[PDB]
Every structure is written in structure tokens, then in C-alpha cells.
């Protein structure tokens, strides 16, 4: 069996090809102690990673090696990969071929360096680097559709027709779950709650995951939340203190539809999705509109598929159906589709093998992978 990893910008999803769900899902985080250990014989470690960094976060500064789908810290990424292999899956990396995964329109250096580290540091037998949105069609059982994938670091559109991608119509938006956590920390300040530290950011991420939703019509929802407390909810901090939340409960996710809330000049997720369909050839658009696939954690908000169908129906011509397939497992659909792909008998000649890498160098990945 192959390994498959979505090295996501916020969570690692790792496991074996042919299994139904990731074996290991954990924070894509390394934490380091900020205070001095006064107590002798304690289990003091130089750094912590994943769920152990998340558990100990009150004494750690927390860093993510991936920002916007780009590996910005290679040492902390190597710590995360070492943790995936030896601690989480607890298999030696030399034994199984590994399907890694990436966002489209990344730096070419990100994929080469990821390839060089797997073959020369972890000594893997073979590996591949798939596009996250292509895997989301494999999980959905499609060969035609436009995938809106939105994780922690990047949002992207990939249109595919009958197994052919249209790489000129691919869209990237460096706005996803982390930018919505940053913005929820900022708009929590105006109700008087201060979240500042790297650990308080993880509490605000949990507030966003538990309470936020997408409002089907933002100005009617803003008028509703100004009229009564009925839209308000409460969250209890690890301190046992309670915070109450109101219009900032849906004004946070609206940054996906209104990127100007975080000050960036770009189209919202509905307009980048429509612009991706309108960059495609005219005969395929009619089938892309019926096959909008949603994937990744930032597509998990209550009401987002209803908002997304409403907005795409207003942009598209009214003479044809808009359908959006946002399945309940879509949080793991990139990994599920990678497990399907790495399990196909017709895929087993598509791996980059170690013997084929060390006659070509890490640029082999640009001609074996999309």
C-alpha cells in the first residue's frame, strides 16, 4: 500500500491508500517553549509537534511551516513529516511510496524541495505530488466539474472536463481559513475580547469552527442581528469565562464573498468560481455549472453551499441549472481522492521512482506531475 498525505496549510491528513479516511489528522504546527523550566526531572522537549503542541500550547509559541500553501519553514516541515512517519502512522518512510499533495500555481521550488527531501532525507522508494483539486474530483466520483477547494491557507478553482484540466482557467486566492481566523481575532476586539498570542489564535479558530456560519443575504442578516439577540451565541474559554458573539458570527465568513473586509483587492469565491467557468471553452461551461464541487475545511460553514448557489445563479445565465455538490465528508475529500488515486492499478506507472529521480534530479517532478 502507498502512503497519502494532504500536507495542508493547517492540518496534516495522513494514511494509507485504499483506506476510507485518514489514519492521522493533526495540526500542521510546531510549538517551542517560551518560558524556563525550573523543575528538574520534567519531560522537557526541545520542540513539540501536532496534537502535543496543541495540548501544551499555554507554554509554547506555535508556528505553522506552511503559509498560503507554500512551505515557509523547511525545518518545521521536516519535523512534521518525521512526526507523520515515525510517531503518527509509525511506519519507516523507505517502505511505502508516498502521494504528497499541493495547491495549483505554487512556487516550482516548493515541489522540487518537497521531492528532494522525500528522496534524500526520508529515502522514500517512490513518490508523486498531486493537485488537491484533481483529487477532490476522484473522491466525488466525477471526471467533469469545477472544484472550489478551500483549506486553511489557500482557496483555488480547478475546472476539469472529461478528465482534461484547463490550466489557463485555474484560479488561486491566497485567502482561506487562517485569514478568517485573523479577521475573527480583529473583529472580536470590537466587542472587547482580546486574543493576541499564538495560543489564543487556536481558541479563536475553535470559536470560528463552532459558531460561525455563512449568511444567505448579508444585509438582511446584519439588519436581523441589529434588531435582536436571537442570532447571538455563547462560547466558554479554557479559563471558564464566557464570551457572547453576534453579527461577527457571520461577518467573519463573509470575507470569502467580500475579500475587501481584510483589505485585499480581489473577487469573492463566487466571482472567482464564475470567472474560472467563463475562462473555459463555451461548450463545457453548461456542464461545469452543474458540477461545482466544494472541498476542504473552509467550505464547512453552515449555509455556504446555499449562499454559493444563490451567488453563482445571479452571475450565470438563468437558462441553465446551477448545482453545487458539497458532501458531508468534504473536509477529507482531497485525502480520500488521493487514497483512490494511489490505489488505482492504472496509476502504478505514474509514480516518480528513486532510480528515476537520481538520473534526473528534483526537476523530474515538473514532467511527471501536473
Amino acid at each position: 500500500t502507498a502512503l497519502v498525505c494532504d500536507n495542508g496549510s493547517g492540518l496534516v491528513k495522513a494514511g494509507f491508500a485504499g483506506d476510507d479516511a485518514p489514519r492521522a489528522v493533526f495540526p500542521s504546527i510546531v510549538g517551542r517553549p517560551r518560558h524556563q523550566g525550573v523543575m528538574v526531572g520534567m519531560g522537557q522537549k526541545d520542540s513539540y509537534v501536532g496534537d502535543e503542541a496543541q495540548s501544551k500550547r499555554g507554554i509554547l509559541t506555535l508556528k505553522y511551516p506552511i503559509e498560503h500553501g507554500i512551505i515557509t519553514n523547511w525545518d518545521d516541515m521536516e519535523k512534521i513529516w518525521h512526526h507523520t512517519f515515525y510517531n503518527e502512522l509509525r511506519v519507516a518512510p523507505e517502505e511505502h511510496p508516498t502521494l504528497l499533495t499541493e495547491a495549483p500555481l505554487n512556487p516550482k521550488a516548493n515541489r522540487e524541495k518537497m521531492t528532494q527531501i522525500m528522496f534524500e532525507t526520508f529515502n522514500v522508494p517512490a513518490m508523486y505530488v498531486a493537485i488537491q483539486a484533481v483529487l477532490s474530483l476522484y473522491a466525488s466520483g466525477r471526471t467533469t466539474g469545477i472544484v472550489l477547494d478551500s483549506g486553511d491557507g489557500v482557496t483555488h478553482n480547478v475546472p476539469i472536463y472529461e478528465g482534461y484540466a484547463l490550466p489557463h482557467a485555474i484560479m488561486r486566492l491566497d485567502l482561506a481559513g487562517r485569514d478568517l481566523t485573523d479577521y475573527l481575532m480583529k473583529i472580536l476586539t470590537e466587542r472587547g475580547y482580546s486574543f493576541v498570542t499564538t495560543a489564543e489564535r487556536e481558541i479563536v479558530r475553535d470559536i470560528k469552527e463552532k459558531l460561525c456560519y455563512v449568511a444567505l443575504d448579508f444585509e438582511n442578516e446584519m439588519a436581523t442581528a441589529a434588531s435582536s439577540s436571537s442570532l447571538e451565541k455563547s462560547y466558554e474559554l479554557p479559563d471558564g469565562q464566557v464570551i457572547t458573539i453576534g453579527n461577527e458570527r457571520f461577518r467573519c465568513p463573509e470575507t470569502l464573498f467580500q475579500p475587501s473586509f481584510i483589505g485585499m483587492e480581489s473577487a469573492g469565491i463566487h466571482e472567482t468560481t464564475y470567472n474560472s467557468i467563463m475562462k473555459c471553452d463555451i461548450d463545457i461551461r453548461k456542464d461545469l455549472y452543474a458540477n461545482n464541487v466544494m472541498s476542504g475545511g473552509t467550505t464547512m460553514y453552515p449555509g455556504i453551499a446555499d449562499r454559493m448557489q444563490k451567488e453563482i445563479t445571479a452571475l450565470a445565465p438563468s437558462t441553465m441549472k446551477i448545482k453545487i455538490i458539497a458532501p458531508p465528508e468534504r473536509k477529507y475529500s482531497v485525502w480520500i481522492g488521493g487514497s483512490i488515486l494511489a490505489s488505482l492499478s492504472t496509476f502504478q506507472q505514474m509514480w516518480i521512482t528513486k532510480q528515476e529521480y537520481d538520473e534526473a534530479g528534483p526537476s523530474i517532478v515538473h514532467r511527471k506531475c501536473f
Partner: protein, 187 residues
């Protein structure tokens, strides 16, 4: 062997004397001390040695003497002391040069073993002679290098910072059964 001048390092308990064969003095004479700190890890790069370590106690570095009572007892600190001796002060490439090292007559088999692996695997020197230290001090006693001025029989009393040892040498041979050591010296 290479035609480059051998490098001489007498690492004493108090002082290290560093230089090249055939000079009229050591190039450096400074304390056998290391100043060490007490998101990439670099605290093993941050150390200092010798006169430049004495300047660092006010900057919060812990000073230590890796040689005490004549014997090396901290091989982390002695490896860092030698790399800084070779690459800062002597400013030399070990692959081009043969080295003369020293230690007391008593010194453990373990110390010469640990010395050889640091010299041949860490630094990769071309070759190493670990000398019997006060036997060299007999040869420094000559009035000149010419064979007619040599006195190959004599007792040598060596007393440095850490240990004093009395060595009988006759016709150039060390009478090892007759070595005496007193564990008391300049410190």
C-alpha cells in the same frame, strides 16, 4: 608526509601554546578555557576560547577549563577548543598539515583514543603525533639544535598549572617505571 610545516599544540591545564614548527616562539599562548552559553539551534557555534573567553564572563557566558589536573575531561569542549584553535587562531587546513599534540605521562588510553578520533574524523588531519610532554622539555634545554650540544640523559621536572611530574630520561629513552607525579601545581 606533506612538505608543509607541522602544527604544534601544547594544551596545558592553564595555558594552550599554539604554533608552527621552526618558529622562535609559539604564535599564541592563552588560557585552556572555553566560554559557552548557559529558531535554529546554534549555541555550539556561539562559544569563545583563550583570551577572548576571559572577556565574555560579563556577557553571561559560563567559562570552563576542559583540562583539569593535566587530563582532558570534557570532550565536547576540547573538540570546540581545537576547532577554534585550528580555524580562528592557527587559521590552517588540517588536511594539509601534520600535528604534534601533548598530554601528561599518566594520561588514560581513553584520552589518546578520544584525541585521535577528533583529529582524524572531525578535523581530518593528515597525521598526528601525541608526544610525551616533558620529554620535549628536555630537548628545549639544549644550547643549540646541533648534535654536539645535546644532553640525552637528564631528569625533567615539569610543573604547569594542573600537575607536576618528574620524568627520568637516559640516552633519549624514558624510564617509564620511574615516573613520579605530584597532583599539585600552579593552580
Amino acid at each position: 608526509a606533506s612538505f608543509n610545516v607541522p602544527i604544534i599544540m601544547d594544551n596545558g591545564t592553564g595555558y594552550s601554546k599554539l604554533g608552527y614548527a621552526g618558529n622562535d616562539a609559539p604564535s599564541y599562548v592563552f588560557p585552556t578555557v572555553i566560554a559557552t552559553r548557559s529558531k535554529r539551534a546554534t549555541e555550539d557555534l556561539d562559544f569563545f576560547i583563550g583570551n577572548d573567553a576571559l572577556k565574555k564572563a560579563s556577557a553571561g557566558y559560563s567559562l570552563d577549563y576542559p583540562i583539569r589536573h593535566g587530563q582532558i575531561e570534557n570532550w565536547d569542549h576540547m573538540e570546540r577548543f581545537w576547532q577554534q584553535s585550528l580555524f580562528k587562531y592557527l587559521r590552517c587546513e588540517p588536511e594539509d598539515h601534520y600535528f604534534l599534540l601533548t598530554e601528561p605521562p599518566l594520561n588514560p588510553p581513553e584520552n589518546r583514543e578520544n584525541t585521535a578520533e577528533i583529529m582524524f574524523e572531525s578535523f581530518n588531519c593528515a597525521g598526528l603525533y601525541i608526544a610525551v610532554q616533558a620529554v620535549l622539555a628536555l630537548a628545549a634545554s639544549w644550547t643549540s639544535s646541533k648534535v654536539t650540544d645535546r644532553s640525552l640523559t637528564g631528569t625533567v621536572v615539569d610543573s604547569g598549572d594542573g600537575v607536576t611530574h618528574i620524568i627520568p630520561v637516559a640516552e633519549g629513552y624514558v624510564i617509564g617505571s620511574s615516573i613520579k607525579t605530584m597532583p599539585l601545581a600552579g593552580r
